[PDB]
Design a protein around this ligand. Structure first.
Ligand SMILES: Cc1cc2nc3c(=O)[nH]c(=O)nc-3n(C[C@H](O)[C@H](O)[C@H](O)COP(=O)(O)OP(=O)(O)OC[C@H]3O[C@@H](n4cnc5c(N)ncnc54)[C@H](O)[C@@H]3O)c2cc1C
Ligand SMILES: Cc1cc2nc3c(=O)[nH]c(=O)nc-3n(C[C@H](O)[C@H](O)[C@H](O)COP(=O)(O)OP(=O)(O)OC[C@H]3O[C@@H](n4cnc5c(N)ncnc54)[C@H](O)[C@@H]3O)c2cc1C
Lengths: 467, 467
């Protein structure tokens, strides 16, 4: 008789969870090692708490102002952050148990180890247990899903100051009167707007422009939206010195001296691979410290796989989870590959930013001839009925075939409409085909149809005679 | 040389507008006859003003209460309906000019006639001009796009009372202290909730249950939502007598006497065909007075077509417009057909109701073997982060092929997510295929993926290990 394959999984986030359970489903015995709180980033200090805080911020914002204030009185709502934090944390704790702890526990095929793991060789790990001492974990196959951590730049004086990373910001029980934010990452912007809406006077220090690595139209729309609601966005600005004196932060910048009660550093994230002793297992990493893998999540060592934020993969929990599931399949004798061709991405600012497929620049870089159309939101019925036309919907197609290969949008509910675009791309639809489909009038997603029609029709024909 | 085809179009709503412009594009000369305001129903007294009022109502509602009131103070906002009405009307007037008047005017190929048309024979119309007198309009082909009007039941005393139809309700400059609503139609419910949120004490008299003709789960969720915010829903209730005494309505019902300041009658709509003298042109209508047509919008008379609410077609402006465009193609020698297989439908209540494709009952009626899954919103991350789990997402598939053939949902933003379902159905995707696609975490549309996964996975595996 054959013994169950011994699978070791380092981490307990989205990638590790998906892998652990898939491995067990495929008949393997799993030993999962986690050094901190079970659940990793998303449920504890990532997606979940941040989206909850953003929703609370949205309510506070709408109680403060709206496009209908001429007929509906508005007020400055009193905010009790302690109560909001308690509500937020209760849901986080509830989900951690329901989707992580409760599933890992009570399963004789899964052994959870509380400690920090490192490779001993390519078939075993050495674990420094949280309760002291060590333990060796032998394995046939191992999945590294250690995620990433907030990056902290070597700005003089920052290291020893009481600054915040996204974790401390989300866990704060008070809304600071003044919040300075260093960075222009998605995390930086989502938190910047949430705190602003909850009461903070926010100043964002962007080294370049917002969404510098994305299509330029995106950063322009978001920057204008932030400024419109009192958020200061200092472009091409960096702090050369950080100091904390007399109970406040003092930042020396290229724009002058800036003072704030709290400082959020959200420049980016780095892979958690330095404590893994990857060299002992022959696992190669790139210049950024990320573990190199192929579409099957296989590393340079045939018996070791990697998935999630500790690799070069896009940093989204749904990508990490999909990768973990497929890595487990391959660790158990299968043959699976991760396809990210129609991977959507959403930024939970207001308006939201959403993208899928190729941007014009990205297509060109890959030698693809394209054409595009950019429809401003003042052409979308839903936006007009809401009296909020900030934003746009951009479609990118391949020349000749007219196949839709990319969509970028800045608009309320962009995250919802982007999935229609994702399916259109997945099914290799042309813009003509998308435009000929029936869409509900007065929905934001109708904007996709309207934009598609502009490839063969005039903007003046939309919502009238563009069929 | 050949002369331009003479096309007559009766009406100026979505169907007529799309047809008129398509006909001209195809080389025809158009004579469009309209007895009332240009633009018809949607822009003037339908979709546009109603969605604007609903958005205003949403803001008022959120300023009054939210799932985050434990940490964000709320207040009863003062409402100035005169100001809201002015804003609403200005957008309506703006859109009427931009998408209707400005496009019809200044075009030598289009002649707009202000009057009421009726058939003289199958090649001409007699028009009673609004300014007096008549005119004959000869045509080679004619499109009837006369729409429908609010139905008014023969309830004793109703006829002579100062009741409202959706038109008077949308045009009211005051929010009534008490509003009674007779009917359970989409129009009745959308307006009922809007007025309630803007300040009225609303009572809905439904002859049966809400969404009686739809899947039962829909009516149950909507009824619970209405009651949750103070809207009284009297099921299986009809008014046997209407009276207006001492400045108020007095309704005798099976539930007892009900008094209200205003009365909205929104039971349904009837086709505008009684004044057309259709018999003079040999155009057949059904028992409801609707004009009978085929998929090419052709009537019993080869030279006359019909599209929109005056036919048996679904009453949506996007359906009317699509039909008008295709009718114009056929009137000008083409061969087009309207495909409604993936037609989405949205109800702008909160939560919204959205459907596409077959419901279980509808599939069975057509001899299709099916299976389904109903995912309650407390299983959708976005709903949980919003602390509002009222609703559900239901998927209907064909047995054997596992092809998705229908989706019904009750949830915030259901109108946005339903389009993803529409494209999935259009592309004949199976639930497994839909479930294997990447969806953004914490978006309502992710609910489609989660529901799809329940066809092969347990609800406890969702957002964890259902891959
Ligand atoms: C503020 C914020 C907001 C975000 N918003 C979104 C969003 O809206 N949508 C989205 O899809 N993604 C979002 N993300 C990103 C998403 O959270 C991550 O991509 C995802 O959680 C990564 O999952 P993972 O399994 O790769 O890693 P992780 O969940 O980060 O976990 C790795 C785990 O391994 C442990 N570990 C590390 N080294 C060792 C070791 N040597 N031994 C034992 N255990 C070790 C860690 O302690 C941790 O528990 C957000 C992130 C943040 C920080
Ligand atoms: C309150 C309300 C809310 C709605 N919400 C939505 C929604 O959210 N989404 C959606 O898609 N649909 C919605 N609808 C329905 C949508 O408005 C209609 O289906 C659509 O407007 C019908 O277009 P049509 O061109 O067929 O007719 P219409 O736009 O109704 O116009 C027919 C025109 O012909 C004229 N006419 C009639 N008889 C004659 C004659 N003998 N001679 C000359 N002119 C004549 C009329 O006066 C009118 O201008 C709503 C309707 C109402 C009333």
């Amino acid at each position: 008789m054959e013994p169950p394959v011994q699978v070791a999984v380092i981490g307990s986030g989205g990638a590790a969870m998906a892998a652990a359970l898939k491995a067990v489903e495929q008949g393997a015995q799993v030993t999962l090692i986690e050094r901190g709180t079970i659940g990793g980033t998303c449920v504890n200090v990532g997606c979940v708490p941040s989206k909850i805080m953003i929703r609370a911020a949205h309510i506070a914002h709408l109680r403060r102002e709206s496009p209908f204030d001429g007929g509906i009185a508005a007020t400055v709502p009193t905010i009790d952050r302690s109560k909001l934090l308690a509500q937020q944390q209760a849901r986080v704790d509830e989900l951690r148990h329901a989707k992580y702890e409760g599933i890992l526990g009570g399963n004789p095929a899964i052994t959870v180890v509380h400690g920090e793991a490192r490779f001993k060789d390519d078939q075993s790990l050495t674990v420094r247990l949280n309760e002291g001492g060590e333990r060796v974990v032998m394995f046939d196959r191992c999945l590294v899903a250690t995620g990433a951590s907030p990056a902290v730049p070597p700005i003089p004086g920052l290291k020893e100051s009481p600054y915040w990373t996204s974790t401390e910001a989300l866990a704060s029980d008070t809304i600071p009167e003044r919040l300075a934010v260093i960075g222009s990452s998605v995390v930086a912007l989502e938190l910047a707007q949430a705190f602003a809406r909850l009461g903070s006077k926010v100043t964002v220090l962007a080294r370049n422009t917002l969404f510098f690595r994305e299509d330029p139209a995106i950063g322009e729309a978001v920057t204008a939206a932030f400024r419109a609601e009192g958020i200061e966005v200092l472009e091409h600005t960096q702090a050369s010195q950080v100091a904390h004196m007399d109970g406040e932060f003092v930042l020396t910048t290229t724009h002058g001296e800036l003072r704030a009660d709290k400082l959020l550093v959200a420049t980016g994230r780095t892979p958690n691979t330095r404590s893994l002793a990857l060299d002992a297992a022959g696992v190669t990493v790139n210049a950024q410290g990320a573990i190199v893998i192929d579409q099957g999540m296989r590393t340079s060592n045939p018996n070791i796989y990697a998935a999630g934020d500790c690799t070069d993969q896009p940093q989204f929990v749904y990508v990490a989870a999909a990768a973990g599931t497929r890595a487990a399949i391959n660790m158990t004798g299968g043959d699976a590959a991760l396809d990210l061709t129609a991977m959507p991405a959403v930024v939970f600012t207001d308006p939201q930013v959403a993208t899928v497929g190729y941007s014009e620049a990205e297509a060109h870089h890959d030698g693809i001839e394209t054409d595009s159309r950019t429809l401003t939101l003042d052409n979308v019925p839903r936006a007009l009925a809401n009296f909020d036309t900030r934003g746009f919907i951009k479609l990118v197609i391949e020349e000749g075939s007219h196949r839709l290969i990319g969509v970028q949008a800045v608009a309320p509910e962009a995250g919802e409409l982007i999935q229609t675009a994702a399916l259109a791309i997945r099914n290799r639809m042309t813009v003509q085909e998308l435009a000929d489909q029936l869409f509900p009038y007065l929905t934001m997603v109708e904007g996709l149809k309207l934009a598609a029609q502009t490839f063969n029709k005039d903007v003046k024909q939309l919502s009238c005679c563009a069929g």
